[PDB]
Design a protein around this ligand. Structure first.
Ligand SMILES: *[C@@H]1O[C@H](CO)[C@@H](O[C@@H]2O[C@H](CO)[C@@H](O[C@@H]3O[C@H](CO)[C@@H](O)[C@H](O)[C@@H]3O)[C@H](O)[C@H]2NC(C)=O)[C@H](O)[C@H]1NC(C)=O
Ligand SMILES: *[C@@H]1O[C@H](CO)[C@@H](O[C@@H]2O[C@H](CO)[C@@H](O[C@@H]3O[C@H](CO)[C@@H](O)[C@H](O)[C@@H]3O)[C@H](O)[C@H]2NC(C)=O)[C@H](O)[C@H]1NC(C)=O
Ligand SMILES: *[C@@H]1O[C@H](CO)[C@@H](O[C@@H]2O[C@H](CO)[C@@H](O[C@@H]3O[C@H](CO)[C@@H](O)[C@H](O)[C@@H]3O)[C@H](O)[C@H]2NC(C)=O)[C@H](O)[C@H]1NC(C)=O
Ligand SMILES: CO[C@]1(C(=O)O)C[C@H](O)[C@@H](NC(C)=O)[C@H]([C@H](O)[C@H](O)CN)O1
Ligand SMILES: CO[C@]1(C(=O)O)C[C@H](O)[C@@H](NC(C)=O)[C@H]([C@H](O)[C@H](O)CN)O1
Ligand SMILES: CO[C@]1(C(=O)O)C[C@H](O)[C@@H](NC(C)=O)[C@H]([C@H](O)[C@H](O)CN)O1
Ligand SMILES: *[C@@H]1O[C@H](CO)[C@@H](O)[C@H](O)[C@H]1NC(C)=O
Ligand SMILES: *[C@@H]1O[C@H](CO)[C@@H](O)[C@H](O)[C@H]1NC(C)=O
Ligand SMILES: *[C@@H]1O[C@H](CO)[C@@H](O)[C@H](O)[C@H]1NC(C)=O
Ligand SMILES: *[C@@H]1O[C@H](CO)[C@@H](O)[C@H](O)[C@H]1NC(C)=O
Ligand SMILES: *[C@@H]1O[C@H](CO)[C@@H](O)[C@H](O)[C@H]1NC(C)=O
Ligand SMILES: *[C@@H]1O[C@H](CO)[C@@H](O)[C@H](O)[C@H]1NC(C)=O
Ligand SMILES: *[C@@H]1O[C@H](CO)[C@@H](O)[C@H](O)[C@H]1NC(C)=O
Ligand SMILES: *[C@@H]1O[C@H](CO)[C@@H](O)[C@H](O)[C@H]1NC(C)=O
Ligand SMILES: *[C@@H]1O[C@H](CO)[C@@H](O)[C@H](O)[C@H]1NC(C)=O
Ligand SMILES: *[C@@H]1O[C@H](CO)[C@@H](O)[C@H](O)[C@H]1NC(C)=O
Ligand SMILES: *[C@@H]1O[C@H](CO)[C@@H](O)[C@H](O)[C@H]1NC(C)=O
Ligand SMILES: *[C@@H]1O[C@H](CO)[C@@H](O)[C@H](O)[C@H]1NC(C)=O
Lengths: 175, 328, 328, 175, 328, 175
């Protein structure tokens, strides 16, 4: 949608991720693994529930109103009774149609946004030690075991700890 | 730091999002079918089929319309002094007493319907010089002739029908609804037989208003043995005002007043069954749940109900776009 | 890998977007004139000037209004049994028969207008004891006197006007519209000359309703040589019901019934020319194209038309913001 | 608009680009050139047509209604006939005014977005071999002939092929 | 290139945004209380309490309703030929002349209210054979009896009430409003005493319309010593048309016409004080400022006013989200 | 909001910034300082005023209308007079509620956007001489006195002037 992460630079979703809406898969020293990210999942979920509750906020109540079905032909007054209701219905129908269209449009950009925010957050954290492969995966240029992967995920990764290792691996090489 | 930190390996971390095998199509500003992970329906489109008898007070009219219950057709005597939040009128209702017509039937049905009470107070009208309590065989009360319970048909006494001129003060602190009427005979003979004068007249007034109706002699279609008709009228008397009924023939006199109130009452035409359940929103198709914001069951509603809409389905996306990883 | 690239140079790649010399200003949430590459107009603001005669069935009333075509003013006899999707009434229309007035002209014009048919069935009413087919010189049919084709003016036979009491059952399975009327004389002399009784009366009824109208004697303004008037009334008779017409003088009797139907018909006042073209939306200013969503030509429409709006222009941006590189 | 590419970090549009809405201009070892990008042009165009068709979706039809022009003065009933229509017109006019305002606002951020997405995509692809000059132009630090410029544009550019050349040119120098 | 010379160090630059200690909660698409730096109120919810007498022309009715000012109740003679943009009717108004009722009071009050003028032109009607200028002690003008200034009560001369048949052409180029009426006596004796004929009749007509009203004899409630009533009617005569008044008893004749106009005038019921100030929007609660887009003071307005809304507060965020350093 | 700068990667606002809505805070070898950024403050303010004026654009005026308060009970015609107004009020109330909701939502993303655009602009400018600490602060890897900080803020900073100094400080070190 607007940010181009979902259905954008991130090729497709993981049908296998059952524990959250956004998350990580890694492949490292000890093997490959996957983990949902619960903060962005909660951010996305809370906003959609916020939106949802506002839409289900108060059905107003109405008691005696006007007749809306007639058995005889009467002319001028019944024509108006019918016209008042038909124009009320079309206006409320327009409203409903536009409301779900704006709402849905926004829910897709909101979730696109949270995906992209998670990406940007992880980028910022890895600092000079990783490169973006451009498909939503980072190449981490230093030995990063499972506890290292867990510190990136839980947000405690210290880039300085691996900076000289990574900068060496990443740049020096032979050019 | 360490010493020559030599282990030159790398790792790969990939961010992604979920996807579901199934998925629901929703409309957007720019697309009208885009598939999302999940959605929720905002249009209620089905009724239970039954009018729940709770929380509103539903009064089933059975085979009485509200106006016949009001006038007191013998067969509707069950409803005297009854009250309701919603009076349900059934398609099977029938009248079965003296043939009558109500000039603005629609306003009287409305005005009573939202007052919500048929509480009747009898007042001591004194009709001197006329015969009271006339009835008809078209309005059988039990084995005998009868008439509407709330009306009083006056005819001559001996050889004369006087000019009646009665008055009834509204000394209470509420408005009083008086239903009265006039008898239109079929023949000039019927006119003189019953009311002596060859041309009747009824004038009902207050300090604020007056209605003078004169009868109309002529044959109408045979309805329950009769070609005569009575037409029904109403007068509201405000506190401190006074009713004066003045007639010279053909008056169908009031026996007292219905009291009026202000509330949330209304009337509904429905053949749906009343049942025991609690439901706030009533539709002539039966109750419906007001959990969704819009409904498409019926444009007639009573109670806390969703806003009626022409659409029968409107799905609100409650998840991201579905971009499946194969689809299984 | 590769060998000595002696030269090691660089390149420049720049991303950009188009811009157009021209550009259109549109309104935004935050700006009310911002310039974009392109836009499209959403308000239709011009008519062709002609009412296209296709796809709806346009009936041009020429110099007849719908009610005169209904009653059968001689000059509107062209329209007998005619039908329409849209009856166009012209400002030039004129009546030219016995002066009449229709108490709720607006409902009768409506009720007929959406029925969409002037199909008339003559029924065999038998009027015993009165002279039928009265006409007037203000309603010339050809060289002679005449009257409305669909009405029948009854006057006395010899020295008597009896009490007419006729009945006509609705045995068909559709509703029947009966147009009838009453003659209001100018003088008590006119009254007795024509109807004998010094006070006429007309009561038309069904099982469901009744109307009793009594005439009113007095001079009105001279219209086509006359100070008398006839007032027009209507009664719909449902299947299985029965009409009873009972009068004692002054009846202008029905000759049969118009049949009623339910459709998309309506009536429009317009002096626009009818022309051959297909157009779905009709406006009293002529047809307009319903390609745009909103229109500002006229708030009166018939057919598939844009929603009338007060604005006369609303441009929807169909391109990016225009940021050109030259000066202005 | 929201992303600040159009009329933002990209100073102005090219009146000369006639073959598409977004695109590239380069200068390389072989000379200068311009080329429209057709994928982002189609993305932007498809979304605006989507939006457009939704707005032109079904004029509803109405036949017998109420009278809206009167020749006599009648009082209470005609006052209501007039009031029903006048309030219907103001409500539909409000709707039209708000609709094009939301719509237009969104079309400018949508197109701002596609510009910025094209930029981000190209950034990601050039990896460590180019630097952002900050005006929407990348400085590519390696010899890049016309076929090289074509591979960036058609999305097949291999950064590895030029990584040591570029990293040398870009960093080493004398600091 | 640039030569450092000696220093080796770094700097830190941080971008940020403001925050305020206070902050206002606003509603969002996804939240219903989110705190922002600043907001502005869009619902006007308070009146000044006074109706500003500028820019619209306010006419304070004091203790006259518009209809009594129109008819010319003695105590409302202050209003003759008066004009207004807004006529304010006060709850304290009272009538104090012959008891009358107006069949469609609501349309006559409307029709006059938006015409905006009580300019009366007297015309020379000649009533031959009747006594003019009848008055009553219930309508005291000064020490004497009186009647409505704009109406003329005709009674018999000697022993006869002729058939009046008068006419008044509309030769001007504007519409003329004629207010006339009929007297309903209490007794047949009153009828014959005043109008000789035992049954009166009034027919007022033009080329386009006619009304025939017949009186109704009977006692109504004593109001200012009287049981009789007069009912008020109105006829508009278009340019080139002609009024014909024809009666045989009970006519309360017009003395001329009110002229009609088309403008922005209306009427309002309010007990608010009129005061000197300029305000465009008037509410029965007093003027309100139309700077905000919505208002919640009253659904009745006159002038350039905000759109009435059920909400009493709606804040529009005019700043970023408030994320403070300490707390809120 | 959508960009995740405000109440996002920028932890919280500065109650002390009184001279503008967005701005800078620095710490160099000569001292510490704060300065509002006036261009992004004006951008944010102008858009919110634009939005504001559109909402206060023309109260339309209405003169004779229909009665909205009644003292007697009349039935069919008065029921319709009441129903016309009650459905008009609910429709205008819906409109007002939805309008401030969309509006407010957009004002938060708009201001989030301007914050993030200021950040991106400053990033682009510092080029290879600074690193993002990820909390909205850049670490400038070269000696940058107060005139240097002023040139970044007023947008005249020349990265080339400090590039070898910065690249040395930033990379070389010992890895
Ligand atoms: C005026 O004309 C009407 C219509 O012709 C007359 O009405 C009809 O009157 C007869 C005799 O009273 C009614 O007959 C009864 O019908 C029922 C049901 O069929 C039957 O049970 C009785 O044995 C008897 O036959 C007839 O139904 C009635 N029809 C209608 C449509 O009303 C009326 O009597 C005439 N009045 C005068 C005074 O001339
Ligand atoms: C009651 O009063 C009205 C109004 O004064 C009388 O109406 C007028 O009657 C005369 C004589 O019939 C009409 O004269 C006609 O004028 C036309 C030209 O306009 C001419 O072509 C005819 O040959 C005839 O001379 C006059 O027009 C008419 N005016 C109006 C406004 O209706 C009416 O006759 C009086 N009736 C009685 C019984 O006193
Ligand atoms: C028809 O019946 C009504 C109601 O009974 C009669 O009305 C009442 O008539 C009396 C005598 O005129 C009125 O009395 C007067 O009241 C005023 C105020 O108190 C006082 O100043 C007089 O001295 C006298 O008492 C009484 O108010 C009035 N009441 C009502 C409700 O109208 C009417 O007179 C009867 N008419 C006939 C012809 O029988
Ligand atoms: C036909 O016989 C009856 C009837 O209806 O049963 C007998 C009944 O006692 C009598 N009631 C009175 C008070 O007179 C009525 C009326 O005279 C007629 O209904 C007038 N249409 O007639
Ligand atoms: C003036 O002469 C005529 C006419 O109108 O031409 C002759 C016509 O044959 C006659 N028709 C009948 C059935 O009586 C009428 C009516 O008597 C009057 O119109 C009553 N206003 O009068
Ligand atoms: C009671 O005495 C008066 C009155 O009202 O003061 C005297 C007055 O001169 C007289 N006016 C005329 C023109 O007759 C009226 C009317 O006769 C009655 O009001 C009819 N209800 O009666
Ligand atoms: C983050 O991960 C590392 C490795 O599991 C662990 O030691 C650290 O405490 C974790 N921190 C949090 C807050 O979970
Ligand atoms: C889909 O959305 C609705 C509303 O948010 C929720 O009740 C439901 O559980 C959701 N479905 C799933 C599988 O999460
Ligand atoms: C109806 O209620 C009134 C008021 O209490 C009472 O006097 C009257 O007798 C009641 N009648 C019936 C039939 O319940
Ligand atoms: C509800 O009732 C109406 C009329 O009885 C019917 O046409 C409609 O289809 C019904 N809808 C549902 C959901 O029952
Ligand atoms: C402008 O937009 C309309 C609708 O998208 C389109 O028909 C038209 O061709 C566009 N103009 C140009 C020059 O592309
Ligand atoms: C009108 O149509 C009916 C029904 O077919 C027919 O009997 C009648 O004679 C027609 N009359 C004319 C004038 O067409
Ligand atoms: C359409 O007709 C109306 C009334 O005839 C006129 O006022 C209006 O300006 C016309 N508009 C157009 C586009 O013709
Ligand atoms: C991309 O460009 C290069 C150079 O023109 C060419 O060899 C390659 O096949 C192109 N690929 C595609 C998919 O166009
Ligand atoms: C809050 O917003 C309103 C409207 O923009 C403005 O007049 C007011 O000055 C603002 N408050 C502050 C403290 O800026
Ligand atoms: C009312 O105005 C008219 C027209 O100028 C005038 O002739 C008439 O005498 C005025 N009457 C009063 C009481 O002002
Ligand atoms: C305005 O007046 C109405 C009726 O007089 C009252 O109910 C309402 O509360 C008042 N509101 C204000 C703000 O005065
Ligand atoms: C930017 O800052 C430097 C240092 O104060 C100054 O020399 C330069 O002229 C400034 N430029 C502008 C445009 O303010």
């Amino acid at each position: 949608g607007l940010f181009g992460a979902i259905a954008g630079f991130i090729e497709n979703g993981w049908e296998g991720m059952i524990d959250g809406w956004y998350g990580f898969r890694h492949q490292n020293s000890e093997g490959t693994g996957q983990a949902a990210d619960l903060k962005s999942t909660q951010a996305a979920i809370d906003q959609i529930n916020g939106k949802l509750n506002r839409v289900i906020e108060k059905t107003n109540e109405k008691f005696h109103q006007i007749e809306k079905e007639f058995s005889e032909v009467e002319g001028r007054i019944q024509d108006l009774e019918k016209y008042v209701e038909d124009t009320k219905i079309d206006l409320w129908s327009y409203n409903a149609e536009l409301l779900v269209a704006l709402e849905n449009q926004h829910t897709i950009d909101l979730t696109d946004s949270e995906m992209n925010k998670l990406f940007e957050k992880t980028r910022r954290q890895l600092r000079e030690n990783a490169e973006e492969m451009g498909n939503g995966c980072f190449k981490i240029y230093h030995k990063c075991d499972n506890a290292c992967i867990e510190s990136i995920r839980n947000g405690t990764y210290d880039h300085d700890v691996y900076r000289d290792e990574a900068l060496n691996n990443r740049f020096q090489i032979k050019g | 730091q360490d010493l020559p930190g030599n282990d030159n390996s790398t790792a790969t971390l990939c961010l992604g999002h979920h996807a579901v095998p199934n998925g629901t199509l929703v409309k957007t500003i720019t697309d009208d079918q885009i598939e999302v992970t999940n959605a929720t329906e905002l249009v209620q489109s089905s009724s239970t089929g039954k009018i729940c008898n709770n929380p509103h007070r539903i009064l089933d009219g059975i085979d009485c319309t509200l106006i016949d219950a009001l006038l007191g057709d013998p067969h509707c005597d069950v409803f005297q002094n009854e009250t309701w939040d919603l009076f349900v009128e059934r398609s099977k209702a029938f009248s079965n007493c003296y043939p009558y017509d109500v000039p603005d039937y629609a306003s009287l049905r409305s005005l009573v319907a939202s007052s919500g009470t048929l509480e009747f107070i009898t007042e001591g009208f004194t009709w001197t010089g006329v015969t009271q309590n006339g009835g008809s065989n078209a309005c059988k009360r039990g084995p005998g002739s009868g008439f509407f319970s709330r009306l009083n048909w006056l005819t001559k006494s001996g050889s004369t029908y006087p000019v009646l001129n009665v008055t009834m003060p509204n000394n209470d602190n509420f408005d009083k609804l008086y239903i009265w009427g006039i008898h239109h005979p079929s023949t000039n003979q019927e006119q003189t037989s019953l009311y002596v004068q060859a041309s009747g007249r009824v004038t009902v007034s207050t300090r604020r208003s007056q209605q003078t109706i004169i009868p109309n002699i002529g044959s109408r279609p045979w309805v329950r043995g009769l070609s005569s008709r009575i037409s029904i009228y109403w007068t509201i008397v405000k506190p401190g005002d006074v009713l004066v009924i003045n007639s010279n023939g053909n008056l169908i006199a009031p026996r007292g007043y219905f009291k009026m109130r202000t509330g949330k009452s209304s009337i509904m035409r429905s053949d749906a069954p009343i049942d025991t359940c609690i439901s706030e929103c009533i539709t002539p198709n039966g109750s419906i749940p007001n959990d969704k914001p819009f409904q498409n069951v019926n444009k007639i509603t009573y109670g806390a109900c969703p806003k009626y809409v022409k659409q029968n389905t409107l799905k609100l996306a409650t998840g991201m776009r579905n971009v499946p990883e194969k689809q299984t």
